[PDB]
Every structure is written in structure tokens, then in C-alpha cells.
């Protein structure tokens, strides 16, 4: 399986800087997180569609980080420097691997726009977000302009985002917000990102491909060397048997769960032997 | 090992539509690492991108050509196309196909082999 | 043309001429590679260098490529007659929409 130790698959997959797994995995039959992880969208916001990236990234037999928009060339005339104290690693604001924070240059944000033709004959799973200012100052300092739009179209996707500034509750310390959003891009297709301001960059995408049909299991058991046909959030179990009342939600070729003590069916004869 | 040939020299009406093919020999045009171009040039000045496209027909252009040009590509007949809208004098140049092979498009690392003979292309009342 | 090229340059035979290609923030600034190409009088380009220093096969050790800061330069020592052709270089613009630049050419002459 992958592992997550203290982060859930958000801050896996957006790359929140206290999650890394160092020389990552290319392929899992299995998601293991924590009942509670503590890192995950270290910058408040909501993630679209959340349950759906969970079930559809549960098995993947192949998988390569590409980055899409590189962070050092791609952004000539806009700063990428951007950081955040809810977002920190080690002593030091910083952000997330997988996106980039634009801001201006110069005194401004000049018109961007980024296509990305799919060249890997995989699945591409392109991640972005807006960011939602918390006062109109905020908005007109970093993206100079009051006006601001977001377009990510493909063959199959197509949202215009319009940054909404509001008095919000501080999570994180922040009053501010970025939505973080996806898509799976289908292969040979094209992605456009469009803006004038509050874009959340894609840096790396993910070519993929989605496995079987799995699941994530939240447990605190160790990880082993072992290979199961049947995985229990608490163990894995012996599958040559019909039934099991170990636990009702398992990932594998399984054997029925039931509520049952004992099932034990007689061969032999009774034994009365005195 | 890839050899490439445009289609014929000809004639283009101004404010029409130029069309032109690329014949892909001696390899598939249907190849992942690998985004087909089309380059000109007016006779006696420089070499200028158009654009680049993927054998699925997911392509890249130039910016200032964006909304005049059209690449495709068709696996079949293993040739790549170009189509470009409301054509002025300036439009009267050497047009050549060349290909990429392409890793990650927006690091920039790629160049163009396997260039073409050239097709000249009169746009003309 | 994004990249910017000597109209002309010269050389007596055997001596070294260096093209030079100067780019911008955008381009070569950037950390985008260099590629050159020799066109012949009436042929279609050619690939000289690629990679910034690569040379493909048939391309001798008297043409070199370097590459330093927004700025790349074509080297050829040892000047022969056959090298008096145009020459571009290409490279990368970040600027809009990621697209592939040539420089505006330059004709060698190979003097004597």
C-alpha cells in the first residue's frame, strides 16, 4: 500500500511541505492514513470533490510526478515566491511542492495563459486552486484588480472561477481561503489555464494509471513485509475460509463477514469414548 | 530514422485558407515522444515556429499565429496538417515540417530534427 | 525575432568566428537550451548543435556550442569554405503561451 504516515491524501497530493514519503512509490494496491492525520491543506479552503479523488486514487498501477508548468521558467513577468505561515516547514512560511503562488510583478499581474497538450498516453491528474482574498486591499495588492477570473477548460471540463473576498472565521490564522480543485485529464487531451489574478498554478501533475478498485484503510498498524489475499484495518486474514467476523470493512477477495462466535461443521462421529 | 515530406507548391487566393501535409516515412507519426512541426520562412528572411502538434491533435502555436492556425494529425494515412485562415502577402514563404521529441514541453530542452525539403507558398490576387 | 543575431560575420580560412545569440529573461535567461542550425543557399535548415554543445552525427569537433547567463554563442575554429552558410539559433520563450523561438540569422563568409 502507500503509506501516508501523518498526512491525508490532500496533503499528499498537493504536496503540503511536512509530506514527502522521500523517494516516492510508483504504483499501490491500498491506502493507508491515520484516523486522524494532522497534515493536510495547511492553507484553509475546500477541496472539490474530495471522496471522489479518495475512491479514484486508491489503486494505481502506474504513476510519475511530471512538473507540468516548471515553477523557475514558466512565470517571467509574476512573482512565485509566494509563502504562507499556515503552510510552514521546518521554522519557515513555505508552501505547497505541487502548486504555485502567483502574485505581481513590477506593480502588476499581467494576463496569463497556459495550455498542456496530455503526451503521456495515461490518465493526467492536473491539480490547481483560487485563492479568495479576505478584504479588497489584499485583492488589489497581489493581483491588481478588481475584476478577476479564472478559466481551466479541456474537452471535458470547462469552470470560469471568480474570486469572492469575505470577513471569515481565521483557520489556520487565516481569514483568507484557496479552493483547490481537479480534474483527470484524459490522454491526448488539452488543458487551458487562463487568468488575471487569484490562480493557484498547477507545478506537478500526475500521469496515472487508476487501478482495480480499491480503498483507503485508516489504521495504526505496522507495516509488513507480508503478502494477503484479505487486508482488515487492523490486520490481514487468512482468505481459504467462507467467513470471517474479524471486521466488516475489508479490501480483497474476502470472506464474508459475519456477526458469529463460532462455526464449526462435524466430520467425524460423535466422541464418547467411556 | 524518421523522413519527412511536405505537399505541393501552389497558389494561395489572398484572404483564404493555405492547407498543407506532412508524409511522415520510415516511422509512426502515432509515437508519445514526439510533437510534429511546422516552420516557414520568406525567401530571404528568417526561420519562424508556426506550431507543434501531437499525434491525438493536442497542440502548441505560435502566439502571434494562435488564432489563425489549425494542426491535426492522422494516424492513418501517417501524415500531419496545417491550416491557416485569411492569409496576407506576408503569408508567402518556404513552409517546412520538422518533429520534436518531447519529454516535458514546458521545460523548454527541445529542438527540431528530421526537417522536410520545404513547399513555397504564393499568396496571390 | 526573440533571440537576436549578428546580421554578418567573416573569417579568413583557418581562423575561429563565434555567432553569438542574445535572449532575454523570458528565453535563455529562463534556463531554456540553446539549438543552432546551418542553412545551405537554397536547402532546407539543418541541425548543427542541440543541447546547447550536443553535436549530432556528421557535424565535425571545429563547430562548439556555450551557453552563459541569456546569452549563447556557435563557435567554429578552424574556418573551411563549406561553412559559408545562414545561421540560427532556436530556443524557448515562457513569456505567454511556451512557445519555440529562432534567432534573426547570420550569414558566415568565408573570406580568401
Known amino acids: 500500500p502507500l503509506q501516508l504516515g501523518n498526512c491525508s491524501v490532500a496533503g499528499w497530493i498537493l504536496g503540503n511541505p511536512e509530506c514527502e514519503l522521500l523517494i516516492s512509490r510508483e504504483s499501490w494496491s491500498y491506502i493507508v492514513e491515520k484516523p486522524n492525520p494532522e497534515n493536510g491543506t495547511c492553507y484553509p479552503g475546500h477541496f472539490a470533490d474530495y471522496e471522489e479523488l479518495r475512491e479514484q486514487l486508491s489503486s494505481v498501477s502506474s504513476f510519475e510526478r511530471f512538473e507540468i508548468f516548471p515553477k523557475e521558467s514558466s512565470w517571467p513577468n509574476h512573482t512565485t515566491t509566494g509563502v504562507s505561515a499556515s503552510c510552514s516547514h521546518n521554522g519557515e512560511s513555505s508552501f505547497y511542492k505541487n502548486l504555485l503562488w502567483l502574485t505581481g510583478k513590477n506593480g502588476l499581474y499581467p494576463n496569463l495563459s497556459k495550455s498542456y497538450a496530455n503526451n503521456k498516453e495515461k490518465e493526467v491528474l492536473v491539480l490547481w486552486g483560487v485563492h479568495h482574498p479576505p478584504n479588497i486591499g489584499d485583492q488589489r495588492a497581489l493581483y491588481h484588480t478588481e475584476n478577476a477570473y479564472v478559466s481551466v477548460v479541456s474537452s471535458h471540463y470547462s469552470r470560469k472561477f471568480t474570486p469572492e473576498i469575505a470577513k471569515r472565521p481565521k483557520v489556520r490564522d487565516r481569514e483568507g481561503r484557496i479552493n483547490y480543485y481537479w480534474t483527470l485529464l484524459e490522454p491526448g487531451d488539452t488543458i487551458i489555464f487562463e487568468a488575471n489574478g487569484n490562480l493557484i498554478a498547477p507545478r506537478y501533475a500526475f500521469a496515472l494509471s487508476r487501478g482495480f478498485g480499491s480503498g483507503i484503510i485508516n489504521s495504526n498498524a505496522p507495516m509488513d513485509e507480508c503478502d494477503a489475499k484479505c487486508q482488515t484495518p487492523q490486520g490481514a486474514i487468512n482468505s481459504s475460509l467462507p467467513f470471517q467476523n474479524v471486521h466488516p470493512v475489508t479490501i480483497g477477495e474476502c470472506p464474508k463477514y459475519v456477526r458469529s462466535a463460532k462455526l464449526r461443521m462435524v466430520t467425524g462421529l460423535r466422541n464418547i469414548p467411556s | 530514422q524518421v523522413q519527412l515530406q511536405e505537399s505541393g507548391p501552389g497558389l494561395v487566393k489572398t484572404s483564404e485558407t493555405l492547407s498543407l501535409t506532412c508524409t511522415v516515412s520510415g516511422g509512426s507519426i502515432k509515437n508519445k515522444d514526439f510533437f510534429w512541426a511546422w516552420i516557414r520562412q520568406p525567401p530571404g528572411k528568417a526561420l519562424e515556429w508556426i506550431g507543434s502538434?501531437?499525434?491525438?491533435?493536442?497542440?502548441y502555436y505560435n502566439w502571434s499565429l494562435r488564432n489563425r492556425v489549425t494542426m491535426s494529425a492522422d494516424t492513418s494515412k501517417n501524415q500531419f496538417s496545417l491550416k491557416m485562415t485569411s492569409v496576407t502577402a506576408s503569408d508567402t514563404s518556404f513552409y517546412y515540417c520538422?518533429?520534436?521529441?518531447?519529454?516535458?514541453?514546458?521545460?523548454?530542452?527541445?529542438?527540431?530534427?528530421?526537417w522536410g525539403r520545404g513547399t513555397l507558398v504564393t499568396v496571390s490576387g | 525575432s526573440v533571440l537576436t543575431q549578428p546580421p554578418s560575420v567573416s573569417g579568413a580560412p583557418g581562423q575561429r568566428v563565434s555567432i553569438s545569440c542574445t535572449g532575454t529573461?523570458?528565453?535563455?535567461?529562463?534556463?531554456?537550451?540553446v539549438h543552432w542550425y546551418q542553412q545551405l543557399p537554397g536547402t532546407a535548415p539543418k541541425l548543427l548543435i542541440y543541447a546547447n554543445n550536443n553535436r549530432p552525427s556528421g557535424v565535425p569537433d571545429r563547430f562548439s556550442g556555450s551557453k552563459s547567463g541569456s546569452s549563447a554563442s556557435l563557435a567554429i575554429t578552424g574556418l573551411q569554405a563549406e561553412d559559408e552558410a545562414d545561421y540560427y539559433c532556436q530556443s524557448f520563450d515562457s513569456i505567454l503561451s511556451g512557445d519555440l523561438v529562432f534567432g534573426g540569422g547570420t550569414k558566415l563568409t568565408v573570406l580568401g
Open positions: 502538434v501531437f499525434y491525438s491533435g493536442g497542440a
Open positions: 529573461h523570458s528565453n535563455i535567461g529562463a534556463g531554456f537550451d
Open positions: 520538422a518533429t520534436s521529441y518531447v519529454d516535458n514541453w514546458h521545460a523548454g530542452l527541445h529542438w527540431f530534427d528530421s
